[PDB]
Amino acid sequence: MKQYLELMQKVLDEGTQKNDRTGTGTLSIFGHQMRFNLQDGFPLVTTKRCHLRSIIHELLWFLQGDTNIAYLHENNVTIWDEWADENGDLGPVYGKQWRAWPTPDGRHIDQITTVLNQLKNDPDSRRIIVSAWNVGELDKMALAPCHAFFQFYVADGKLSCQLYQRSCDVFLGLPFNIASYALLVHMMAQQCDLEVGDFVWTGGDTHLYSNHMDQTHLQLSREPRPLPKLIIKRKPESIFDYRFEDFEIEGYDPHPGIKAPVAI
Amino acid sequence: MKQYLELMQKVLDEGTQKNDRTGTGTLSIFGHQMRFNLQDGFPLVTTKRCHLRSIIHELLWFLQGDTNIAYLHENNVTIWDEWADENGDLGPVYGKQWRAWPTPDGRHIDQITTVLNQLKNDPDSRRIIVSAWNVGELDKMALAPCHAFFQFYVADGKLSCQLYQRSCDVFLGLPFNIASYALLVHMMAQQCDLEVGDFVWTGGDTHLYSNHMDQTHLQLSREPRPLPKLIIKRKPESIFDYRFEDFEIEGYDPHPGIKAPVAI
Numbered sequence: 085m086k087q088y089l090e091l092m093q094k095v096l097d098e099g100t101q102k103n104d105r106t107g108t109g110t111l112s113i114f115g116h117q118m119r120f121n122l123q124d125g126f127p128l129v130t131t132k133r134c135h136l137r138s139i140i141h142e143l144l145w146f147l148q149g150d151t152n153i154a155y156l157h158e159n160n161v162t163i164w165d166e167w168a169d170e171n172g173d174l175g176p177v178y179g180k181q182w183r184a185w186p187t188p189d190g191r192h193i194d195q196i197t198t199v200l201n202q203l204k205n206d207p208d209s210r211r212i213i214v215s216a217w218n219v220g221e222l223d224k225m226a227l228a229p230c231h232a233f234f235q236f237y238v239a240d241g242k243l244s245c246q247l248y249q250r251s252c253d254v255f256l257g258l259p260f261n262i263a264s265y266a267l268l269v270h271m272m273a274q275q276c277d278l279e280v281g282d283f284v285w286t287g288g289d290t291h292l293y294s295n296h297m298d299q300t301h302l303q304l305s306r307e308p309r310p311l312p313k314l315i316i317k318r319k320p321e322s323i324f325d326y327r328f329e330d331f332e333i334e335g336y337d338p339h340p341g342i343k344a345p346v347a348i
Numbered sequence: 349m350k351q352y353l354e355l356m357q358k359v360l361d362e363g364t365q366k367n368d369r370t371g372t373g374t375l376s377i378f379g380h381q382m383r384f385n386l387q388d389g390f391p392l393v394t395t396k397r398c399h400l401r402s403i404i405h406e407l408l409w410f411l412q413g414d415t416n417i418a419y420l421h422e423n424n425v426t427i428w429d430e431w432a433d434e435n436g437d438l439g440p441v442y443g444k445q446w447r448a449w450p451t452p453d454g455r456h457i458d459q460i461t462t463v464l465n466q467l468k469n470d471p472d473s474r475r476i477i478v479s480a481w482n483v484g485e486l487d488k489m490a491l492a493p494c495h496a497f498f499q500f501y502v503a504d505g506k507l508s509c510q511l512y513q514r515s516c517d518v519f520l521g522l523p524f525n526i527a528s529y530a531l532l533v534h535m536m537a538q539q540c541d542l543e544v545g546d547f548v549w550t551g552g553d554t555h556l557y558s559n560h561m562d563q564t565h566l567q568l569s570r571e572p573r574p575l576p577k578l579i580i581k582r583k584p585e586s587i588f589d590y591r592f593e594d595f596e597i598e599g600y601d602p603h604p605g606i607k608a609p610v611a612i
C-alpha cells in the first residue's frame with residue numbers, strides 16, 4: 085500500500101541499529117503516523133500475499149475474550165503457537181483486557197461493550213478508548229501488548245479509529261495489524277449505523293529486523309495494486325456474534341507471498 | 349512554534365463543528381503528530397507568554413505521587429482548583445498512577461522507578477512506558493487523563509519520548525503539555541547520563557473551543573521567535589529530588605500573554 089511502503093523506506097533511510105532481547109538486531113525509528121481512508125478500500129497489503137483468514141479468526145477470538153490458542157487451532161490458525169505455554173495459554177493478553185480488565189476492587193470492565201455504548205449514545209465523547217496496557221498484569225502475559233491502546237472518533241456520520249502501536253515489526257506484524265483494526269472499524273460502524281472513516285496508525289519503536297532486509301527490498305520493488313473491498317453479508321445482533329463466513333474480500337489481487345523468519 | 353501554529357491553522361481550516369460535554373462547542377480534527385528536536389531548543393511557545401511556574405510545580409507534584417492540590421496552593425498554582433473536591437482531592441489521577449499503579453492483587457507498581465531502571469539497565473527495551481489510563485480507576489478520578497500514555501526510546505545516546513494525548517485543548521492546554529513532557533525528558537536524561545533527543549506529540553481529539561477563536565486569530569498573526577534553552581543548575585540524587593529553583597529558562601522572548609476562558 086502506498087503509505088506502508090513509504091514507512092518501510094523511512095525506516096531504511098532514517099533508522100538506527102538497535103539490538104533486542106539478546107536477539108536478532110533491528111533498524112528502528114521512533115514515532116510515525118499514517119492514515120487510511122477506509123472509503124478508499126480495505127487496507128490489506130497487495131505487494132505481498134497476506135493470510136486474511138488468520139486475521140479474521142484472530143479478531144473474532146479477541147472479541148470473545150479468549151487467550152488460549154485452542155480456538156485458533158480448531159480453525160487451523162498457528163500465528164500464536166510460539167508464545168503459548170504447554171496448555172495453550174498466553175496469559176491475560178489482548179482479548180482478556182478488552183473484555184474483562186480487572187480492577188483493584190474485584191470488578192472487571194468490558195471495554196468493547198463500553199465503547200459500543202459510547203458510540204451509540206455519546207459519540208462526541210473524547211474518551212472512547214480501549215487499552216490493553218494493564219501495567220499490573222504485564223508480568224502474567226506471554227508478550228506485552230504491541231497494539232496497546234486505541235481510540236474511536238465520530239464526525240459527519242463516519243467512524244474513525246487511532247491505534248498506538250508501541251512496538252512494530254514492520255515487515256511481518258504490521259500488515260496483519262492494519263487489516264485487523266480496519267475490520268474492527270467496519271464491524272463497529274455496522275453495529276452503530278455509521279459509515280467508515282479513517283484508520284490512523286501511530287507507531288512507537290517502529291523497526292525492521294536485520295534478517296528481513298532482502299525481503300523488505302523485494303517488496304519495495306513492487307507496485308501497489310488497487311485496494312480490495314470488504315463486504316459484510318449479515319447484520320448480527322451484537323458485535324460479539326459475527327462469524328468468519330459473514331465476511332468477503334473482493335478484488336484482492338496481490339503480488340506473490342514473501343516468506344520471512346519470525347523473531348520470537 | 350511553527351508546528352504548533354500549523355496545527356492551530358489546520359483545526360480552523362479542517363476542523364468539524366462538534367457539541368461537546370461542556371456545551372461550549374469545538375472545532376476538532378482526529379489524529380495529528382508533531383516532533384520537537386530538543387537539541388534545537390526548549391519547546392515553549394513564543395507566540396504567547398506561557399508561565400513556566402505552573403508547569404514546573406505540576407510536574408514536580410506528579411513525580412511526588414501526589415493527587416491533592418495542597419502542594420500546588422502552597423506554591424500559588426491554581427490550575428487544578430475547579431476539579432478538586434472540598435478537601436483538595438482529585439482521586440487517583442496522574443500522580444497516583446505514575447508512582448503507585450495498583451495491581452488487582454493489592455500490590456503496586458512504581459512506573460517512574462521502573463522506567464529509570466529500564467533506561468539505566470535495558471535502554472534498548474521497546475516497552476519503556478508510563479500509562480495513566482488505568483481503566484479500573486477512571487470512575488474514581490475527577491477527570492479522565494488527557495495526556496494518557498507516554499513511551500521512552502534510546503538511540504545513539506539520546507533520550508526521546510512520545511506522548512499520546514487523547515484529548516487536546518489546542519489553545520490553553522497544548523503549550524503547557526508540550527513544555528511539561530519536554531522538561532521531564534531533560535530530567536530523565538540528566539539522571540541517566542543521556543543526551544536529549546526528540547519529543548514526539550501525538551493527538552487524538554484535537555480541538556479549538558468556539559470561544560477561543562478571537563484569541564486564535566490573534567496568535568496566528570504573530571511570528572514565532574527562536575526557542576529558549578533550558579538549564580538545570582543542580583543534579584539531584586534522584587528524579588524525585590528536583591526543586592523549582594533547579595530550573596532556568598534562558599533567552600525566552602515571547603509575545604504577550606493571551607487570556608481565554610477555560611471550558612470546564
Ligand SMILES: Nc1nc(N)c2c(n1)CC[C@H](CNc1ccc(C(=O)N[C@@H](CCC(=O)O)C(=O)O)cc1)N2Cc1cn([C@H]2C[C@H](O)[C@@H](COP(=O)(O)O)O2)c(=O)[nH]c1=O
Pocket residue numbers: 210211369398399402427428431491492494495515516517518520521522524525606607610611612
Ligand atoms: N479546559 C481545560 N484545559 C486544561 N488545560 C485542562 C483542563 N481543562 C482539565 C484540567 C487540566 C489542568 N491543566 C491546566 C493547564 C492550563 C490551564 C490554563 O488555563 N492556563 C492559562 C492560565 C495560566 C496561568 O494561570 O498561569 C494559560 O495558559 O494562559 C488550566 C488547566 N487541564 C490539562 C489538560 C486537559 N486538556 C483539555 C482538553 C479538553 O478540552 C479538556 C478535557 O475534557 P474531556 O475529558 O476531553 O471531555 O481539557 C488539555 O488539552 N491538555 C491537558 O493536559
Ligand SMILES: Nc1nc(N)c2c(n1)CCC(CNc1ccc(C(=O)N[C@@H](CCC(=O)O)C(=O)O)cc1)=N2
Pocket residue numbers: 133134135138162163164167227253256257258259260342346347348
Ligand atoms: N518478532 C515478532 N514479530 C511479530 N510479527 C510478532 C511478534 N514478534 C510477537 C507476537 C505476534 C503475534 N501476531 C502475528 C505474528 C505474525 C504473523 C505472520 O507471520 N503472518 C504471515 C503468515 C501467517 C500464517 O498464515 O500462518 C504473513 O503475513 O506473511 C501474524 C500475526 N507478532
Ligand SMILES: Cc1cn([C@H]2C[C@H](O)[C@@H](COP(=O)(O)O)O2)c(=O)[nH]c1=O
Pocket residue numbers: 104227228230231251252253254257258261474475
Ligand atoms: C502481537 C504483535 C507483536 N509484534 C512484534 C513487535 C515486536 O518486534 C515484538 C514484540 O516484542 P517486544 O515486547 O520486545 O516489543 O513483536 C508486532 O509488530 N505486531 C503485533 O501485533
